[PDB]
Design a binder for this molecule. Sequence first.
Ligand SMILES: COc1c(NC(=O)c2ccc(NC(=O)c3ccc(NC(=O)[C@H](CC#N)NC(=O)c4ccc(NC(=O)/C(C)=C/c5ccc(O)cc5)cc4)cc3)c(OC)c2O)ccc(C(=O)O)c1O
Length: 215
Amino acid sequence: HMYDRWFSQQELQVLPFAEQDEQRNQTWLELVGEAQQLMGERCPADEPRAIALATRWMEQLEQDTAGRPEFLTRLNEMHAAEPQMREQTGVTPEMIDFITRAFAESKLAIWARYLNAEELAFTRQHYFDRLMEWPALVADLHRACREKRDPASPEGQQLAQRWLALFQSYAGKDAQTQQKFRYAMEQEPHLMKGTWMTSEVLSWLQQAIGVMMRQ
Ligand SMILES: COc1c(NC(=O)c2ccc(NC(=O)c3ccc(NC(=O)[C@H](CC#N)NC(=O)c4ccc(NC(=O)/C(C)=C/c5ccc(O)cc5)cc4)cc3)c(OC)c2O)ccc(C(=O)O)c1O
């Protein structure tokens, strides 16, 4: 069976997808069907119904990957190389592209209340520049936070430096603009959806960042 080709026996017991729960399958049946309908209509990704659908997708996908970023990246490996993936899930790379942009717009809608028009335009473009590098970083942050790596060590500062590079990629290099983004996240729970980040890993990261920013 399909997940057994990609997950160890121990991983399979903590992977919700591997349950073939009937209710979970029906939920994804509806999520896929709704995405198919919006795509076939060429629905713009910033329409409310698209943003709402993408928000549901990310909520469900985080739950069904057990909140483990490494399980998310395993699914991405399957979308690239598992022949049965479309047949078994109904999810396609084109569909994922639509959800990705609608989920981006779900965050741009919130950032619009904190940024001016020129900052919003910059981020609407550059949000996508390095977006797909975040799951690898999140996995490396989970491992670091797990092993109580010193946030101030060279290995911790390399992680903070990788965060800054991905953050400045979407936010820009302006200090006042960056502070708007950091304030918005503190104020808006939706901005940390679709991240696989936990309060524990965020604390570890924000300690590493704080060391980087004061120095
Ligand atoms: C806000 O910024 C910050 C931060 N920020 C962050 O830490 C931060 C962290 C991470 C992130 N991002 C991510 O991790 C991230 C980025 C990209 C992705 N993408 C993917 O994985 C890609 C594409 C995209 N996209 N694949 C998918 O989506 C994907 C979609 C669906 C499936 N589905 C299936 O296989 C199914 C359903 C099977 C099935 C089965 C059975 C069935 O019956 C039917 C179906 C599989 C994969 C996902 C997550 C982020 O966002 C950029 C952040 O901002 C931190 C601190 C501060 C501060 O201020 O201190 C701050 O400001």
